């Protein structure tokens, strides 16, 4: 009735209800799959309410929207220096102070192709960062190679932003200076936070390779690390 | 020489891994209901045939599996002997 898309969820309620006592652990150990499961559960429940209670609301409108869960209050907070390689892809909680934010970056989500000779068009889904370009034009009578081409300004994009978080002085080692970590944030949460803000966050602790040069597929042995936030408080 | 190409052939179909599996299991696999839609039951029939086609010969797209089957099915005499044997078993 307020026309809104995101649901908060403090994880302790999963321990109170007997049927979800194990789901709490599975959430921390497998966030990417479990959170997706929760999303597609919430959307179906919203549809079920209007069709079961046979209400006036537009079914198409609810089908069009995206719904997202945002879990929080997951457990004890963790010191920024004490994250170890056995924590990769698990949920984490951090406290700190915001230094700076970069401007919004466009991130592609759907690609748009057009045939150069016969003007057939196809929309393609992006996953794992790779564009799945077609081998030949898919129109039956125009089955030709190298015939499709990309149209940049008819693609679809999404907002990405990077926030720089600094260690709070309460945790710094004796005779040393505070460190910092970088947070990647998307869509709703993009412009939320300013320089000098003090926050607590929740997100998956990720790691990725980096290339030796821009010409070739050669990777370095050290991996970059960052946090992929799903909630801010 | 270059390595020779790998293909679907009647020997695979007549193998124990092949077509006898479908006749040994299809009665138990598929189940229609009036209690579900045409689209529902129609979708259901194709499941088993798809998984079986993958297990038999993973080269190619499902449609290509069916259409490939047509050629050898019409031409090979040994396969046709097996098929008339089935329908004789029902004439038994």
């Amino acid at each position: 009735e307020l026309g809104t898309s995101n649901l908060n969820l403090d994880a302790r309620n999963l321990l109170a209800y007997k049927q979800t006592e194990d789901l709490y652990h599975q959430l921390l150990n497998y966030p990417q799959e479990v959170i997706s499961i929760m999303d597609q559960t919430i959307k179906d429940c919203m549809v079920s309410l209007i069709v079961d209670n046979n209400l006036d609301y537009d079914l198409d409108e609810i089908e069009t929207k995206f719904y997202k869960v945002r879990p929080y209050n997951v457990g004890s907070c963790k010191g920024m220096r004490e994250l170890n390689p056995n924590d990769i892809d698990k949920l984490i909680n951090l406290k700190g102070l915001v230094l700076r934010s970069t401007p919004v970056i466009p991130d592609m989500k759907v690609a748009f192709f057009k045939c150069n000779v016969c003007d057939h068009t196809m929309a393609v889904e992006i996953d794992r960062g790779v564009i799945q370009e077609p081998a030949r034009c898919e129109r039956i009578d125009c089955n030709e190679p190298n015939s499709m081409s990309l149209i940049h300004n008819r693609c679809s994009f999404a907002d990405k932003q990077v926030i720089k978080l600094q260690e709070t002085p309460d945790f710094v080692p004796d005779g040393q200076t505070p460190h910092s970590i970088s947070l990647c944030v998307y869509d709703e949460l993009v412009d939320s936070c300013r320089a000098g803000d003090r926050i607590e966050v929740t997100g998956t602790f990720r790691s990725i390779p980096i290339r030796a040069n821009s010409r070739q597929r050669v990777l370095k042995s050290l991996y970059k690390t960052y946090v992929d936030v799903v909630h801010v408080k | 020489k270059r390595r020779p190409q790998v293909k679907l052939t009647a020997e695979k179909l007549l193998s124990d891994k092949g077509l006898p599996y479908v006749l040994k299991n299809a009665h138990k696999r598929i189940r229609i209901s009036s209690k579900k839609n045409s689209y529902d039951n129609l979708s259901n029939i194709i499941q088993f045939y798809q998984l079986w086609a993958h297990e038999l010969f993973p080269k190619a797209k499902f449609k290509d599996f069916m259409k490939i089957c047509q050629t050898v099915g019409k031409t090979d005499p040994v396969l046709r002997e097996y098929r008339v044997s089935l329908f004789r078993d029902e004439m038994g």
Partner: protein, 665 residues
């Protein structure tokens, strides 16, 4: 050599100035042109350069020279238009022969340069080299001729005709009759020139409008406006309608067929009948766009493209597969489809018509051409008066010609005749379906016996020699004749005509025709379907029937029907109604159930019936779901009675005598 070539080009250029020029005393800024001398010899030698040299050497180089020096646009049009306007003023008032001589000879060059272009394996390498470029220059010609003073050269060409209309046919010498052929031969070209077709040498597997030309210059819409203002449609109408009275029919009535073909071509009749309106339908179309957008959204993930986890799926016998992406976690249908979609191969594929200009035979005609309101009403008026006035008298002459000349025909004249018949008969049926002011008697010359024989004979001879384009057109003509018959039976000799149309020989042919359609292009199969629907429906209302229907039902017809049906994303709402009518006939009435238990039909009904394909509210889903319900009920019964059909469903049915009879039933 190159120098001999440029010497001829220079000779032409000098001839392109010996011709004359405007007057620089005039102080009239600018005046018209002014006339040279030797100019008779100039025109005549140019005529010789075409006929005595370029034709004899098969070049098109001479045309390239005259295009270089822009002779048409620069001299021929103002020479003619000045002659016309001078004589017009003189007529307003109400050696001169020499002026008229120049008028004749300028026009004959206009016909020659704009004559349409043909390329074969017997054309010279020179012509094959020059084809693509001379196309550009002829496009320029069409634009220019329609543009000058809003097209006023076209009044000169008909005034020339009016001199030979003038005095009695009994007087009219052969040289005299050539003018009346020549004038009509001009308008055929002006309509026939249109945007190019790209052509290349197939040595390696890897637009042509020039900078001064655009679509609105060249569109058929333009040509309507141009002819109407310059008074052409009155001439074609008066000339065709009094044709029976002793104008020698022989010289006029084929050129006058080609005009009617050349601008009926590219119109769908529904576009001429309506059945804020533009804005209303645009808004409705935007609703359809929103539905497609919704379809894409329903396959789109909420969280971004690098959030994605991983999925594993375990089969029976405990073997496991791996797929990525967040929607695969929840939708097994999508996971199964996405799993097969990764696999590389597709089987490579097989492919019917060439030699003739674009038409219904080799293009998808679900694409109109677009009219001003004044143009729409003027075009409707022209062909309506043509039908009410000219059609029977034209068809009677042109048909009783061709019966005496069938052996000598060429492919184009066959395809013209069959696509002039078709258009006018259909349009009249539609017009009287709409309204009572119209009547069917206007097109009634098509039915009399001689024409029926001739359409039959064309279809026969085309089929035997395996000429598939004439066979295609003949299929379209023979469709309409049958359609017209069912109209007239819904009101004597017509039953006699039916009985002769449905002698056993013809049933053999008309039964044969869908079987071969499986290989060919999407239009061919569609012609086969619509003809079949009509052919069976007439014989249903004859009351023989059981012999004829059993003749149709067999594997190679069903193959064609499915092969056509699976391209439904491209087809109309109406054609699918026709296909399921036939399946109702095969499955329920005839009770030949065994044909359709074949797997690539079962795939099809899922695709088309899914939330993927046919719209949730189109009339198609009523028919499809009502069919599939019954299909699967009978299939259930069959499979439990005899379990061998599980292995049956993959393969064609089995033609052995001893087991096959029980198999089919």
């Amino acid at each position: 050599a190159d120098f001999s070539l440029t010497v001829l080009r220079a000779r032409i250029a000098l001839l392109a100035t010996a011709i004359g020029g405007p007057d620089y005393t005039s102080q009239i800024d600018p005046p018209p042109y002014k006339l040279g001398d030797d100019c008779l010899a100039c025109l005549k030698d140019l005529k010789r350069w075409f006929k005595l040299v370029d034709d004899q050497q098969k070049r098109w180089d001479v045309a390239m020279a005259v295009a270089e020096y822009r002779i048409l646009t620069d001299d021929l049009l103002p020479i003619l238009i000045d002659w016309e306007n001078k004589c017009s003023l003189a007529a307003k008032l109400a050696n001169k022969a020499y002026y008229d001589k120049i008028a004749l000879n300028c026009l004959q060059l206009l016909v020659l340069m704009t004559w349409p272009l043909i390329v074969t394996e017997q054309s010279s390498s020179n012509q094959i080299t020059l084809y693509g470029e001379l196309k550009k220059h002829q496009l320029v010609y069409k634009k220019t001729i329609l543009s000058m003073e809003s097209g006023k050269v076209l009044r000169a060409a008909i005034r020339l005709a009016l001199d030979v209309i003038k005095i009695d046919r009994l007087s009219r010498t052969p040289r005299d009759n050539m003018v009346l052929k020549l004038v009509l031969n001009f308008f055929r070209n002006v309509i026939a020139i249109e945007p190019g077709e790209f052509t290349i040498n197939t040595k390696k597997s890897m637009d042509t409008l020039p900078p001064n030309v655009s679509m609105d210059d060249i569109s058929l819409n333009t040509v309507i406006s141009s002819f109407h203002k310059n008074k052409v449609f009155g001439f074609l109408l008066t000339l065709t309608s009094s044709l029976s009275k002793e104008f020698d029919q022989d010289f006029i009535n084929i050129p006058l067929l080609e005009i009617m073909f050349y601008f009926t071509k590219d119109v769908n009749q529904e576009l001429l009948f309506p059945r804020t309106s533009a804005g209303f339908e645009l808004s409705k179309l935007l609703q359809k766009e929103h539905q497609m957008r919704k379809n894409v959204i329903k396959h789109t993930s909420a969280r971004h493209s690098r959030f994605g986890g991983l999925l594993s799926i375990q089969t029976p016998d405990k073997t496991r597969l791996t797929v990525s992406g967040s929607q695969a976690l929840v939708d097994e249908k999508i996971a199964l489809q996405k799993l097969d979609d990764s696999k590389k191969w597709n089987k490579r594929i097989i492919k019917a018509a060439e030699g003739l200009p674009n038409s219904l035979l080799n293009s998808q005609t679900g694409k109109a051409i677009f009219f001003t309101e004044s143009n729409g009403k003027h075009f409707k008026e022209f062909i309506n008066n043509f039908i009410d006035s000219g059609f029977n008298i034209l068809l009677h002459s042109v048909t009783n010609y061709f019966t005496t000349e069938q052996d000598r025909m060429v492919t184009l004249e066959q395809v013209e005749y069959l696509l002039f018949f078709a258009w006018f008969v259909k349009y009249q049926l539609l017009r009287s379906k709409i309204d009572n002011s119209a009547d069917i008697k206007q097109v009634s010359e098509a039915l009399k016996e001689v024409t029926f024989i001739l359409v039959s004979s064309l279809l026969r001879s085309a089929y035997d020699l395996k000429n598939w384009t004439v066979t295609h057109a003949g299929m379209i003509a023979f469709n309409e004749l049958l359609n017209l018959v069912s109209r007239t039976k819904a009101a004597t000799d017509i039953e006699f005509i039916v009985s002769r149309l449905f002698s056993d020989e013809r049933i053999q042919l008309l039964s044969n025709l869908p079987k071969i359609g499986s290989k060919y292009s999407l239009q061919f199969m569609k012609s086969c379907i619509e003809l079949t629907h009509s052919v069976l429906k007439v014989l249903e209302q004859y009351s023989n029937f059981q012999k004829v229907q059993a003749n149709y039902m067999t594997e190679p017809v069903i193959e064609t029907y499915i092969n056509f049906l699976e391209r439904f994303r491209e087809l109309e709402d109406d054609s699918i109604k026709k296909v399921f009518s036939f399946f109702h006939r095969v499955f329920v009435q005839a009770k030949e159930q065994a044909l359709l238990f074949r797997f690539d039909l079962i795939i099809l009904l899922r695709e088309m019936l899914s939330p993927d394909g046919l719209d949730r509210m189109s009339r198609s889903r009523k028919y499809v779901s009502q069919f599939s319900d019954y299909f699967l009920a009978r299939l259930k019964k069959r499979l439990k009675k005899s379990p061998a059909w599980f292995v049956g469903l993959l393969f064609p049915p089995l033609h052995n005598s001893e087991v096959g009879f029980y198999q089919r039933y």
